[PDB]
Amino acid sequence: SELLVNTKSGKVMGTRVPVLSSHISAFLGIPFAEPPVGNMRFRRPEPKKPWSGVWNASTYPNNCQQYVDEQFPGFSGSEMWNPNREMSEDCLYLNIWVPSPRPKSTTVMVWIYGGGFYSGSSTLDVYNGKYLAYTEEVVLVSLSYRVGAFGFLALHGSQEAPGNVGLLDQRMALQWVHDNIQFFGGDPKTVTIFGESAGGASVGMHILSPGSRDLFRRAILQSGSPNCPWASVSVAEGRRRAVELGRNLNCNLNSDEELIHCLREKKPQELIDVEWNVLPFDSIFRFSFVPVIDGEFFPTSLESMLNSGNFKKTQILLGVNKDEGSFFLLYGAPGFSKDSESKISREDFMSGVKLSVPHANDLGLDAVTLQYTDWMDDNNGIKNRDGLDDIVGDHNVICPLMHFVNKYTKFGNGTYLYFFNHRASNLVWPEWMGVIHGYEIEFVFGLPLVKELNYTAEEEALSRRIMHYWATFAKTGNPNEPHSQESKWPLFTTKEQKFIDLNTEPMKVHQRLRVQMCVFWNQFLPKLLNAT
């Protein structure tokens, strides 16, 4: 039977799912690790013990325990990101969509979800792998991993909570794919890892980490980079936040062992309820429990690894959206609301800057404010709002990614850079938010091909082109069809620094993506902060 697969861990039974007037096979909720529960909370994951009999892989698995966004109850804009399955610490599962008939040795794509390392689910409507699996004839895997304190509580030196365990979850699922995807018709030597935001930082982290490199062939990073200022902390900062979490829950703080024991007795929601209390600054776009620069998963600082070529050398495809910052300002910054135009006063602008660059002294804050203020028109509410949007997107997403592409490209085997700037016609978020963080994902997963979802014909065409870029890149290391008649997405090179826009217009090629602003964020401001 097409729906039955014997793997090295045991037999699994899938389910036939309809897709665009046809069908494919789905194997949902396959375990890749032992449930990380009880005395295993905070521990490195352990491989799943093989099972006798047939694993029922017909239904989506539990999502990992996480903070749930209740800022706009009933609003689909925000609720589409929330867990749509019961939450459990027993959450280490993966999902596979397989073309029908079962292929023999086809290109594999493995999705790693974002969510700031504090949230995310493999089971979201917008991550449904069937359209891409069906349309491009790939085997589509989505994995899961522990988030929040569960995935990233870091007490370096301890072996009960060393940090990075959520990244090791991701690695274990990649190992499982390596070992077993052949039985689903996947080629384990042609696995592309891809992810958005924290999932894109994750992808870059597996490129960097010696223990992950051999498990995949190539990589796609959407709106996320391993060097993002929000994506990792030092071992000292991770420790401080773990102790502070303990302090919030009235834990004995005399030793790691006393602290960890206390944290292990708490119900999952008890950790989540105080998770946001441990941040060192009043800030936006900062999350509590994130990867830790530990000397193990990352052997040295991210910057020295990037500089020395200490990373996997392969092809990468990556890029950003036009308005990365708007989502985070809406949630944290004064003056921003969902149902107004959010014109921002000079005062709210000033306050926004401080929230956005929490680590800056006053000189640093002045430098940012000057760089992003039109002094001929400093009270223009639209300009101040859009300026903040750029500050947040440039600092947190675009300029770290640009630093990564420039460093990577000197040692890698081929870089393709995009700038996604089409706003979906059916977005329910306000217009001021523009082309929002995360709203290229639906195009990558081919949702615009579903007529009931009410996209335009031009948006279906853009989705088809994006899916085919991603899958062709996955197959060959080049998003372009050989000997094709369409416009060519050129290689990003050190010298010419080319990229393309992704939108509904005819492809345009540009150079030096946001270079003026990224020189400020990547060269000048760090030098300013170090000297003062």
Ligand X SMILES: CN1C=CC=CC1=CNO
Ligand Y SMILES: *[C@@H]1O[C@H](CO[C@@H]2O[C@@H](C)[C@@H](O)[C@@H](O)[C@@H]2O)[C@@H](O)[C@H](O)[C@H]1NC(C)=O
Return residues touching ligand Y (CB under 6 A): 56, 58-59
Instruction: Spell 258-277 as b/e; 16+ CB within 10 A means b.
Output: ebbebbbebebeebbebbee
Give the Cα separation of 231 and 403 in Å (integer).
15
Q: Which does 115 bind (CB under 5 to 8 A by kind): ligand X, ligand NAG, its own copies, none?
A: ligand X
Alpha helices in 333-394 (DSSP H): 346-356, 362-372, 381-393
Instruction: Kindly write down the DSSP assignment for every residue of 242-255, as one continuous string.
Output: HHHHHHHTT---S-
Binding string, 189-218, against ligand X, x = CB under 6 A? -------xx---------------------
The CB density around residue 524, as the number of other CB atoms within 10 Å, is 12
Assess 363 for contact with its own copies (CB under 8 A): yes
CB of 414 to ligand NAG, least distance (A): 4
Report the residue count for the chain.
532
202, 437, 440, 463: the catalytic one is 437
Give the Cα separation of 460 and 315 in Å (integer).
27
197, 209, 212, 223: the catalytic one is 197
Please give the DSSP secondary-structure letter assigned to residue 108: E
Instruction: Spell 104-136 as b/e; 16+ CB within 10 A means b.
Output: eebbbbbbbbbbbbbbbbbbbeebbbbbbbbbb
CA 133 to chain centre: 20
Q: Which does 114 bind (CB under 5 to 8 A by kind): ligand X, ligand Y, its own copies, none?
A: ligand X
Annotated catalytic residue 197: yes
Assess 127 for contact with ligand X (CB under 6 A): no
Annotated catalytic residue 136: no
The CB density around residue 408, as the number of other CB atoms within 10 Å, is 26
Give the Cα separation of 104 and 192 in Å (integer).
17
CB of 490 to ligand NAG, least distance (A): 11
Among 48, 403, 437, 475, binds ligand X (CB under 6 A): 437
Binding string, 55-84, against ligand X, x = CB under 6 A? --------------------------x---
Identify which of residues 112 and 138 has a Cβ nearer to ligand X in the complex. Answer: 112
Q: What is the side-by-side order of every strand in the sheet holding 509-511?
A: 15-19, 22-31, 93-98, 139-142, 106-112, 186-196, 218-222, 315-321, 414-420, 498-502, 509-511
Q: Which does 59 bind (CB under 5 to 8 A by kind): ligand X, its own copies, ligand Y, none?
A: ligand Y
Q: Which does 75 bind (CB under 5 to 8 A by kind): its own copies, ligand NAG, ligand X, none?
A: none
Q: Which residues bind to ligand NAG, rule: CB under 6 A?
A: 413-414
Assess 457 for contact with its own copies (CB under 8 A): no
Assess 515 for contact with its own copies (CB under 8 A): yes
Identify which of residues 323 and 459 has a Cβ nearer to ligand X in the complex. Answer: 323
Give the Cα separation of 411 and 210 in Å (integer).
16
Among 366, 481, 496, 505, binds its own copies (CB under 8 A): 366
Among 125, 282, 374, 496, binds its own copies (CB under 8 A): 374
CB of 179 to ligand Y, least distance (A): 24
Among 4, 236, 370, 428, binds its own copies (CB under 8 A): 370
Give the Cα separation of 232 and 246 in Å (integer).
20
CB of 413 to ligand NAG, least distance (A): 4
For residue 185, give the 3-state DSSP assignment: coil
Q: Which does 531 bind (CB under 5 to 8 A by kind): ligand NAG, its own copies, ligand X, none?
A: its own copies
CB of 250 to ligand NAG, least distance (A): 56
Give the Cα separation of 443 and 450 in Å (integer).
11
Among 367, 401, 405, 462, binds its own copies (CB under 8 A): 367
Give the Cα separation of 418 and 251 in Å (integer).
47
Instruction: Kindly write down the DSSP assignment for every residue of 20-73, as one continuous string.
Output: TTEEEEEEEEEE-B----GGGTTSPP-BPPP-SSEEE-SSPPPBPP-----SST
Instruction: Spell 225-251 as b/e; 16+ CB within 10 A means b.
Output: bbbbbbbbbebebbbebbbbbbebeeb
CB of 120 to ligand X, least distance (A): 6
Give the Cα separation of 414 and 419 in Å (integer).
17
Per the CB < 8 A criterion, the answer to whether 382 and 359 are in contact is: no
Q: Which does 413 bind (CB under 5 to 8 A by kind): ligand Y, ligand NAG, its own copies, none?
A: ligand NAG
Window of 6-14, 112-120, 279-287, 374-382 that interacts with ligand X by CB under 6 A: 112-120
Identify which of residues 115 and 319 has a Cβ nearer to ligand X in the complex. Answer: 115
Annotated catalytic residue 324: yes
Give the Cα separation of 274 and 523 in Å (integer).
36
Among 216, 327, 372, 492, binds ligand X (CB under 6 A): 327
Among 375, 483, 484, 495, binds its own copies (CB under 8 A): 375
Q: Which does 520 bind (CB under 5 to 8 A by kind): ligand X, its own copies, ligand Y, none?
A: its own copies
Residues 376-405, interacting with its own copies (CB under 8 A): 376
Whether cis (ω within 30° of 0) applies to the bond prior to 45 is no
Unique residue bearing structure tokens 């891409």: 132
CA distances from 188 to 3, 53, 174, 308 (A): 20, 25, 10, 29
Window of 235-243, 381-389, 402-410, 436-444 that interacts with ligand X by CB under 6 A: 436-444
CA distances from 152 to 19, 39, 96, 123, 195 (A): 37, 16, 26, 21, 18
136, 160, 196, 324: the catalytic one is 324
CB of 321 to ligand X, least distance (A): 9
By CB under 6 A, name the binding residues for ligand X. 81, 114-115, 120, 196-197, 327, 436-438
Catalytic residues: 197, 324, 437
By CB under 8 A, name the binding residues for its own copies. 363, 366-367, 370, 374-376, 511-512, 515-516, 519-520, 523-524, 527-528, 531-532
